[PDB]
Amino acid sequence: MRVPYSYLERQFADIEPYLNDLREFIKTADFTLGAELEKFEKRFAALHNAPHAIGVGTGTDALAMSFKMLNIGAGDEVITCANTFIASVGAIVQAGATPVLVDSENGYVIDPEKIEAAITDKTKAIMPVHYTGNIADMPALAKIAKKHNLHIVEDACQTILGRINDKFVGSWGQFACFSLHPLKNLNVWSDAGVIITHSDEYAEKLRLYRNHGLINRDVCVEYGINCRMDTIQAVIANRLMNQLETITEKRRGIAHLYDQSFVDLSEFIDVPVRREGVYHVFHIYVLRVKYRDQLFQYLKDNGIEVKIHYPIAMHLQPAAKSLGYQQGDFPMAEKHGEAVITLPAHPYLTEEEINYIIKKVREFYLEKHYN
């Protein structure tokens, strides 16, 4: 059996309804900041019980633009996690700020107990990453931010529908930033980002900033950039998001089945603790395992498209050299690169495929293929 990591071919196999939507959309020629984009934004904001969503060019830009709104840039420090995707740190640098790294904890998110030690006179914000779809410990982070007068920007680019009990992501930061770039639980056919905020003023400012600072075709009130989400992609999003809630819950269901299927293999497989009240959206299903390289080769040889997210931690990337960190600074993020593997875990998998993955993972260890 070959079990694909990507579900895109399956997800968009029933293609005609999308093409039909496009056929009608093209007649309107409403390509730029059009009605469909506003429709999308209102639905997306509502999903997170927030008053405003602003569609922008990419998730990375969403983060950088959030820092711009907060006047965070040259000479400022932004604390984030050493265990994350490059764009998290890239966005800080794009804004002109200096990224400062803190280790992760049991569930791949920023360790709240390690944040204060990293605070300096230059710190202006904390940027927790809701990494793998897990939600950072926001009440703890909010407490720290309040104590030190710091802004929070939530990197939710893997975390549409993320929530802790009564509070959706976006409840704590001035901004929460998301991505619709495939793959995501809600993905369009290109790059796209979204900023949500509860601030009327910041929402208005962002709508100017994403569109050259133009308040109308004749007047630019303040220099801005060209960074808006495409109206035509909002067409795609508006159809797919009809399935967003079901996609996300089914993905959680698969993750739970995996958690249960490996519970007796704690000698070989470390399943992260699932924190109470935390609606982990399982963007990816990541385990820490023994003999990781060997397991990876084995599963691949058996047709399962496993991946590693990611082998080289932020502080060990060539781009990060000038930050001055060294191997040993971030033990959790370092062990992560050595130990993690990601299993295909998307809701377009068949029951047979999911069972096959479980069988092969167990078999590797039970039959001692590591020897």
Ligand X SMILES: Cc1ncc(COP(=O)(O)O)c(CN)c1O
- Annotated active-site positions, please? 184
> Which residues are CB-neighbours of 266 under 8 A, at least 6 positions away?
none
Residues 148 to 187: which contact ligand X by CB under 6 A?
155, 157-158, 179, 181
> Applying CB under 6 A, does 84 fall inside the site for ligand X?
yes
> Applying CB under 6 A, does 60 fall inside the site for ligand X?
yes
> Applying CB under 6 A, does 302 fall inside the site for ligand X?
no
**Interacting partner of 183 out of Na ion, ligand X, none (Cβ under 5 to 8 A depending on kind):** Na ion
Stretch that binds ligand X, among 25-33, 57-65, 137-145, 211-219 (CB under 6 A): 57-65
| Minimum CB–partner distance for residue 365 and Na ion (Å) | 27
Preceding omega of 298 cis (within 30 degrees of 0): no
| Minimum CB–partner distance for residue 14 and ligand X (Å) | 25
Dist. CA 249–CA 280, nearest whole Å: 10
Dist. CA 150–CA 173, nearest whole Å: 10
User: Looking at beta carbons only, is 126 or 129 nearer to ligand X?
Assistant: 129
> Tokens for 27?
């007649």
User: Looking at beta carbons only, is 333 or 361 nearer to ligand X?
Assistant: 333
Dist. CA 180–CA 163, nearest whole Å: 18
* Angle formed by the axes of helices 244-261 and 351-366, nearest 10°: 30
How crowded is residue 5: how many other Cβ atoms within 10 Å of its Cβ?
Answer: 15
> Tokens for 24?
């009608």
C-alpha closest to that of 95 among 124, 121, 119:
124
> Applying CB under 5 A, does 77 fall inside the site for Na ion?
no
**Binding residue for Na ion, selected from 190, 211, 238, 294, defined by CB under 5 A:** 190
Contact 177/59 with Cβ under 8 angstroms?
yes
**Interacting partner of 160 out of ligand X, Na ion, none (Cβ under 5 to 8 A depending on kind):** none
> Applying CB under 5 A, does 183 fall inside the site for Na ion?
yes
User: Looking at beta carbons only, is 159 or 302 nearer to ligand X?
Assistant: 159
Q: Give the count of residues interacting with Na ion (CB under 5 A).
A: 5
> Applying CB under 5 A, does 243 fall inside the site for Na ion?
no
C-alpha closest to that of 50 among 134, 162, 183:
162
Identify the residue whose tokens are 């997210």: 309
Q: Which residues bind Na ion (CB under 5 A)?
A: 137, 183-184, 190, 230
Q: Which residues bind ligand X (CB under 6 A)?
A: 58-60, 84-85, 87-88, 129, 131, 155, 157-158, 179, 181, 191, 193
